[PDB]
């Protein structure tokens, strides 16, 4: 676990907002888990919804302060998570997931390639695959960090960002597989 960190970072109750979710995503009834469907649902235009990225956001954003949440990634072979700005482009095709486009994310491809989605990408070497990922956000200092949340081991912290928009938790899954992404409860 972590020591002085909790105290400094307020644990956030993150629930997924199905109005943002791409039509290919399946948000659970309790709004804690997201899975990918075999085929898109048929959903009318909604400014909130991601039409290109296979993305869903948390319901609430952050404009100030320090916050922590944990995401259970389990054995899923592909996922990316972090935060993004309120004002990202939700409609346009082929927008790269990068800080410059409003995303601060990391995760896994093909079960074994961990990356921080900087531009260019930063390749990460994990001594053990994490199953739960702790995300620490400090809005004012412009820091977002990722940890293995079960042993508390630091993985990666982005270069400083000066955030000038509200930030959402963001979750991306590209592939169809058995294990969902799940937001862990608070205490």
PDB file of C-alpha atoms in Angstrom:
ATOM      1  CA  UNK A   1       0.000   0.000   0.000  1.00  0.00           C
ATOM      2  CA  UNK A   2       0.879   3.692   0.310  1.00  0.00           C
ATOM      3  CA  UNK A   3       1.765   5.605   3.545  1.00  0.00           C
ATOM      4  CA  UNK A   4       1.563   9.450   3.806  1.00  0.00           C
ATOM      5  CA  UNK A   5       0.077   9.506   0.269  1.00  0.00           C
ATOM      6  CA  UNK A   6      -3.404   8.750   1.489  1.00  0.00           C
ATOM      7  CA  UNK A   7      -4.076  11.817   3.581  1.00  0.00           C
ATOM      8  CA  UNK A   8      -2.586  14.013   0.886  1.00  0.00           C
ATOM      9  CA  UNK A   9      -4.773  12.603  -1.899  1.00  0.00           C
ATOM     10  CA  UNK A  10      -8.539  12.490  -1.481  1.00  0.00           C
ATOM     11  CA  UNK A  11      -9.934   9.178  -2.686  1.00  0.00           C
ATOM     12  CA  UNK A  12     -12.346   9.814  -5.534  1.00  0.00           C
ATOM     13  CA  UNK A  13     -15.586   7.855  -6.006  1.00  0.00           C
ATOM     14  CA  UNK A  14     -15.404   7.348  -9.776  1.00  0.00           C
ATOM     15  CA  UNK A  15     -18.421   6.133 -11.660  1.00  0.00           C
ATOM     16  CA  UNK A  16     -18.695   5.806 -15.429  1.00  0.00           C
ATOM     17  CA  UNK A  17     -20.946   8.068 -17.437  1.00  0.00           C
ATOM     18  CA  UNK A  18     -22.730   6.063 -20.139  1.00  0.00           C
ATOM     19  CA  UNK A  19     -23.589   9.268 -22.028  1.00  0.00           C
ATOM     20  CA  UNK A  20     -19.897   9.701 -22.897  1.00  0.00           C
ATOM     21  CA  UNK A  21     -19.246   6.068 -23.755  1.00  0.00           C
ATOM     22  CA  UNK A  22     -18.611   5.081 -27.370  1.00  0.00           C
ATOM     23  CA  UNK A  23     -21.464   2.959 -28.660  1.00  0.00           C
ATOM     24  CA  UNK A  24     -19.164  -0.099 -28.697  1.00  0.00           C
ATOM     25  CA  UNK A  25     -18.702   0.000 -24.909  1.00  0.00           C
ATOM     26  CA  UNK A  26     -20.892  -1.715 -22.286  1.00  0.00           C
ATOM     27  CA  UNK A  27     -21.085   0.182 -18.979  1.00  0.00           C
ATOM     28  CA  UNK A  28     -22.294  -1.975 -16.041  1.00  0.00           C
ATOM     29  CA  UNK A  29     -25.499  -1.135 -14.146  1.00  0.00           C
ATOM     30  CA  UNK A  30     -23.464  -0.092 -11.071  1.00  0.00           C
ATOM     31  CA  UNK A  31     -21.307   2.095 -13.341  1.00  0.00           C
ATOM     32  CA  UNK A  32     -18.042   0.558 -12.076  1.00  0.00           C
ATOM     33  CA  UNK A  33     -17.153  -1.702 -14.948  1.00  0.00           C
ATOM     34  CA  UNK A  34     -16.772  -1.299 -18.701  1.00  0.00           C
ATOM     35  CA  UNK A  35     -16.506  -4.028 -21.280  1.00  0.00           C
ATOM     36  CA  UNK A  36     -16.347  -3.912 -25.053  1.00  0.00           C
ATOM     37  CA  UNK A  37     -19.235  -5.269 -27.107  1.00  0.00           C
ATOM     38  CA  UNK A  38     -18.915  -7.373 -30.230  1.00  0.00           C
ATOM     39  CA  UNK A  39     -20.814  -4.725 -32.231  1.00  0.00           C
ATOM     40  CA  UNK A  40     -21.806  -1.104 -31.636  1.00  0.00           C
ATOM     41  CA  UNK A  41     -25.183  -0.209 -30.219  1.00  0.00           C
ATOM     42  CA  UNK A  42     -27.253   2.224 -32.269  1.00  0.00           C
ATOM     43  CA  UNK A  43     -27.223   5.531 -30.363  1.00  0.00           C
ATOM     44  CA  UNK A  44     -28.482   8.930 -31.436  1.00  0.00           C
ATOM     45  CA  UNK A  45     -26.235  12.022 -31.545  1.00  0.00           C
ATOM     46  CA  UNK A  46     -25.222  13.237 -28.106  1.00  0.00           C
ATOM     47  CA  UNK A  47     -22.493  15.916 -27.814  1.00  0.00           C
ATOM     48  CA  UNK A  48     -21.115  14.022 -24.759  1.00  0.00           C
ATOM     49  CA  UNK A  49     -20.466  10.766 -26.564  1.00  0.00           C
ATOM     50  CA  UNK A  50     -17.118   9.700 -27.966  1.00  0.00           C
ATOM     51  CA  UNK A  51     -17.775   8.791 -31.592  1.00  0.00           C
ATOM     52  CA  UNK A  52     -14.221   7.760 -32.616  1.00  0.00           C
ATOM     53  CA  UNK A  53     -12.192   6.762 -29.496  1.00  0.00           C
ATOM     54  CA  UNK A  54     -13.245   3.615 -27.690  1.00  0.00           C
ATOM     55  CA  UNK A  55     -13.507   5.755 -24.525  1.00  0.00           C
ATOM     56  CA  UNK A  56     -15.749   6.382 -21.527  1.00  0.00           C
ATOM     57  CA  UNK A  57     -15.333   9.077 -18.846  1.00  0.00           C
ATOM     58  CA  UNK A  58     -16.093   9.351 -15.145  1.00  0.00           C
ATOM     59  CA  UNK A  59     -19.212  11.366 -14.310  1.00  0.00           C
ATOM     60  CA  UNK A  60     -17.351  14.113 -12.435  1.00  0.00           C
ATOM     61  CA  UNK A  61     -14.351  16.211 -13.347  1.00  0.00           C
ATOM     62  CA  UNK A  62     -11.528  17.817 -11.302  1.00  0.00           C
ATOM     63  CA  UNK A  63     -10.596  21.495 -11.417  1.00  0.00           C
ATOM     64  CA  UNK A  64      -8.538  21.708  -8.229  1.00  0.00           C
ATOM     65  CA  UNK A  65      -6.946  19.538  -5.613  1.00  0.00           C
ATOM     66  CA  UNK A  66      -5.416  16.130  -5.078  1.00  0.00           C
ATOM     67  CA  UNK A  67      -7.324  12.932  -5.886  1.00  0.00           C
ATOM     68  CA  UNK A  68      -6.708   9.198  -6.103  1.00  0.00           C
ATOM     69  CA  UNK A  69      -8.618   6.310  -7.669  1.00  0.00           C
ATOM     70  CA  UNK A  70      -7.840   2.696  -8.433  1.00  0.00           C
ATOM     71  CA  UNK A  71      -8.664   0.663 -11.495  1.00  0.00           C
ATOM     72  CA  UNK A  72      -8.667  -3.093 -11.581  1.00  0.00           C
ATOM     73  CA  UNK A  73      -7.198  -4.185 -14.892  1.00  0.00           C
ATOM     74  CA  UNK A  74      -6.789  -7.805 -13.923  1.00  0.00           C
ATOM     75  CA  UNK A  75      -5.698 -10.084 -16.740  1.00  0.00           C
ATOM     76  CA  UNK A  76      -7.083  -7.887 -19.571  1.00  0.00           C
ATOM     77  CA  UNK A  77      -4.481  -7.907 -22.344  1.00  0.00           C
ATOM     78  CA  UNK A  78      -5.280  -4.371 -23.613  1.00  0.00           C
ATOM     79  CA  UNK A  79      -6.349  -1.208 -21.773  1.00  0.00           C
ATOM     80  CA  UNK A  80      -5.426   2.436 -21.340  1.00  0.00           C
ATOM     81  CA  UNK A  81      -6.410   4.722 -18.503  1.00  0.00           C
ATOM     82  CA  UNK A  82      -5.670   8.109 -17.002  1.00  0.00           C
ATOM     83  CA  UNK A  83      -7.313  11.497 -17.327  1.00  0.00           C
ATOM     84  CA  UNK A  84      -8.337  13.809 -20.140  1.00  0.00           C
ATOM     85  CA  UNK A  85      -9.453  17.395 -20.488  1.00  0.00           C
ATOM     86  CA  UNK A  86     -13.137  18.291 -20.547  1.00  0.00           C
ATOM     87  CA  UNK A  87     -12.707  19.830 -23.975  1.00  0.00           C
ATOM     88  CA  UNK A  88     -11.050  16.957 -25.921  1.00  0.00           C
ATOM     89  CA  UNK A  89     -12.270  16.361 -29.448  1.00  0.00           C
ATOM     90  CA  UNK A  90     -15.054  13.740 -29.120  1.00  0.00           C
ATOM     91  CA  UNK A  91     -16.208  13.564 -32.733  1.00  0.00           C
ATOM     92  CA  UNK A  92     -13.153  13.664 -35.038  1.00  0.00           C
ATOM     93  CA  UNK A  93     -11.434  10.623 -36.472  1.00  0.00           C
ATOM     94  CA  UNK A  94      -7.917   9.463 -35.833  1.00  0.00           C
ATOM     95  CA  UNK A  95      -7.005  11.999 -33.161  1.00  0.00           C
ATOM     96  CA  UNK A  96      -3.837  10.711 -31.443  1.00  0.00           C
ATOM     97  CA  UNK A  97      -4.039  10.064 -27.698  1.00  0.00           C
ATOM     98  CA  UNK A  98      -1.357  12.500 -26.389  1.00  0.00           C
ATOM     99  CA  UNK A  99      -1.047  15.243 -23.795  1.00  0.00           C
ATOM    100  CA  UNK A 100      -1.105  17.800 -26.620  1.00  0.00           C
ATOM    101  CA  UNK A 101      -4.588  16.470 -27.533  1.00  0.00           C
ATOM    102  CA  UNK A 102      -5.668  16.541 -23.910  1.00  0.00           C
ATOM    103  CA  UNK A 103      -4.907  12.966 -22.718  1.00  0.00           C
ATOM    104  CA  UNK A 104      -2.586  11.752 -19.972  1.00  0.00           C
ATOM    105  CA  UNK A 105      -2.801   7.993 -20.175  1.00  0.00           C
ATOM    106  CA  UNK A 106      -0.859   4.743 -19.884  1.00  0.00           C
ATOM    107  CA  UNK A 107      -1.556   1.042 -20.303  1.00  0.00           C
ATOM    108  CA  UNK A 108      -1.030  -2.239 -22.055  1.00  0.00           C
ATOM    109  CA  UNK A 109      -1.019  -3.676 -25.559  1.00  0.00           C
ATOM    110  CA  UNK A 110      -0.912  -7.418 -26.520  1.00  0.00           C
ATOM    111  CA  UNK A 111      -0.593  -8.507 -22.864  1.00  0.00           C
ATOM    112  CA  UNK A 112       3.027  -7.457 -22.604  1.00  0.00           C
ATOM    113  CA  UNK A 113       3.755  -3.952 -23.951  1.00  0.00           C
ATOM    114  CA  UNK A 114       3.305  -1.225 -21.387  1.00  0.00           C
ATOM    115  CA  UNK A 115       3.500   2.389 -22.632  1.00  0.00           C
ATOM    116  CA  UNK A 116       2.947   5.968 -21.380  1.00  0.00           C
ATOM    117  CA  UNK A 117       1.097   7.716 -24.172  1.00  0.00           C
ATOM    118  CA  UNK A 118       3.452  10.639 -24.509  1.00  0.00           C
ATOM    119  CA  UNK A 119       4.486  11.778 -27.974  1.00  0.00           C
ATOM    120  CA  UNK A 120       6.502   9.998 -28.937  1.00  0.00           C
ATOM    121  CA  UNK A 121       5.402   7.105 -26.706  1.00  0.00           C
ATOM    122  CA  UNK A 122       7.409   6.180 -23.658  1.00  0.00           C
ATOM    123  CA  UNK A 123       8.047   2.465 -23.306  1.00  0.00           C
ATOM    124  CA  UNK A 124       7.697   1.181 -19.787  1.00  0.00           C
ATOM    125  CA  UNK A 125       9.314  -1.900 -18.264  1.00  0.00           C
ATOM    126  CA  UNK A 126       7.204  -3.553 -15.566  1.00  0.00           C
ATOM    127  CA  UNK A 127       8.917  -6.180 -13.405  1.00  0.00           C
ATOM    128  CA  UNK A 128       5.439  -7.611 -12.624  1.00  0.00           C
ATOM    129  CA  UNK A 129       2.136  -7.009 -14.417  1.00  0.00           C
ATOM    130  CA  UNK A 130      -0.075  -4.818 -12.265  1.00  0.00           C
ATOM    131  CA  UNK A 131      -3.645  -5.962 -11.574  1.00  0.00           C
ATOM    132  CA  UNK A 132      -4.841  -2.784  -9.953  1.00  0.00           C
ATOM    133  CA  UNK A 133      -3.525   0.582 -11.020  1.00  0.00           C
ATOM    134  CA  UNK A 134      -3.547   3.532  -8.623  1.00  0.00           C
ATOM    135  CA  UNK A 135      -3.868   6.951 -10.239  1.00  0.00           C
ATOM    136  CA  UNK A 136      -2.742   9.992  -8.278  1.00  0.00           C
ATOM    137  CA  UNK A 137      -3.699  13.410  -9.619  1.00  0.00           C
ATOM    138  CA  UNK A 138      -2.483  16.728  -8.266  1.00  0.00           C
ATOM    139  CA  UNK A 139      -4.241  19.351 -10.295  1.00  0.00           C
ATOM    140  CA  UNK A 140      -2.357  22.410  -9.094  1.00  0.00           C
ATOM    141  CA  UNK A 141       1.119  20.950  -9.362  1.00  0.00           C
ATOM    142  CA  UNK A 142       0.321  19.363 -12.741  1.00  0.00           C
ATOM    143  CA  UNK A 143       1.245  15.812 -11.822  1.00  0.00           C
ATOM    144  CA  UNK A 144      -0.397  12.544 -12.683  1.00  0.00           C
ATOM    145  CA  UNK A 145       1.210   9.322 -11.525  1.00  0.00           C
ATOM    146  CA  UNK A 146       0.466   5.652 -11.965  1.00  0.00           C
ATOM    147  CA  UNK A 147       1.216   2.926  -9.388  1.00  0.00           C
ATOM    148  CA  UNK A 148       0.725  -0.791  -8.885  1.00  0.00           C
ATOM    149  CA  UNK A 149      -1.949  -0.292  -6.211  1.00  0.00           C
ATOM    150  CA  UNK A 150      -1.531  -3.632  -4.446  1.00  0.00           C
ATOM    151  CA  UNK A 151       2.187  -3.402  -3.665  1.00  0.00           C
ATOM    152  CA  UNK A 152       2.255   0.390  -4.012  1.00  0.00           C
ATOM    153  CA  UNK A 153       5.093   0.404  -6.529  1.00  0.00           C
ATOM    154  CA  UNK A 154       5.503   3.516  -8.692  1.00  0.00           C
ATOM    155  CA  UNK A 155       5.253   2.911 -12.426  1.00  0.00           C
ATOM    156  CA  UNK A 156       5.287   6.278 -14.227  1.00  0.00           C
ATOM    157  CA  UNK A 157       4.650   9.965 -13.652  1.00  0.00           C
ATOM    158  CA  UNK A 158       4.091  12.309 -16.617  1.00  0.00           C
ATOM    159  CA  UNK A 159       6.182  15.399 -17.230  1.00  0.00           C
ATOM    160  CA  UNK A 160       4.625  18.425 -15.549  1.00  0.00           C
ATOM    161  CA  UNK A 161       1.366  19.612 -17.167  1.00  0.00           C
ATOM    162  CA  UNK A 162      -0.272  23.031 -16.591  1.00  0.00           C
ATOM    163  CA  UNK A 163      -3.887  21.987 -16.622  1.00  0.00           C
ATOM    164  CA  UNK A 164      -6.179  24.753 -17.854  1.00  0.00           C
ATOM    165  CA  UNK A 165      -9.295  22.654 -18.261  1.00  0.00           C
ATOM    166  CA  UNK A 166     -11.240  20.359 -16.001  1.00  0.00           C
ATOM    167  CA  UNK A 167      -9.980  16.762 -16.051  1.00  0.00           C
ATOM    168  CA  UNK A 168     -11.965  13.537 -16.234  1.00  0.00           C
ATOM    169  CA  UNK A 169     -10.967  10.022 -15.505  1.00  0.00           C
ATOM    170  CA  UNK A 170     -10.788   8.334 -18.866  1.00  0.00           C
ATOM    171  CA  UNK A 171     -10.859   4.672 -19.828  1.00  0.00           C
ATOM    172  CA  UNK A 172     -10.064   3.122 -23.192  1.00  0.00           C
ATOM    173  CA  UNK A 173     -10.455  -0.486 -24.342  1.00  0.00           C
ATOM    174  CA  UNK A 174      -9.961  -1.469 -27.966  1.00  0.00           C
ATOM    175  CA  UNK A 175     -10.317  -5.222 -27.930  1.00  0.00           C
ATOM    176  CA  UNK A 176     -13.007  -7.793 -27.188  1.00  0.00           C
ATOM    177  CA  UNK A 177     -11.997  -9.964 -24.293  1.00  0.00           C
ATOM    178  CA  UNK A 178     -13.381 -11.673 -21.260  1.00  0.00           C
ATOM    179  CA  UNK A 179     -12.183  -9.412 -18.467  1.00  0.00           C
ATOM    180  CA  UNK A 180     -13.708  -5.976 -17.888  1.00  0.00           C
ATOM    181  CA  UNK A 181     -12.080  -2.820 -16.547  1.00  0.00           C
ATOM    182  CA  UNK A 182     -13.325  -2.171 -13.041  1.00  0.00           C
ATOM    183  CA  UNK A 183     -13.194   0.826 -10.722  1.00  0.00           C
ATOM    184  CA  UNK A 184     -12.387  -0.241  -7.186  1.00  0.00           C
ATOM    185  CA  UNK A 185     -14.398   1.071  -4.256  1.00  0.00           C
ATOM    186  CA  UNK A 186     -12.961   3.734  -2.016  1.00  0.00           C
ATOM    187  CA  UNK A 187     -11.712   2.520   1.395  1.00  0.00           C
TER     188      UNK A 187
END
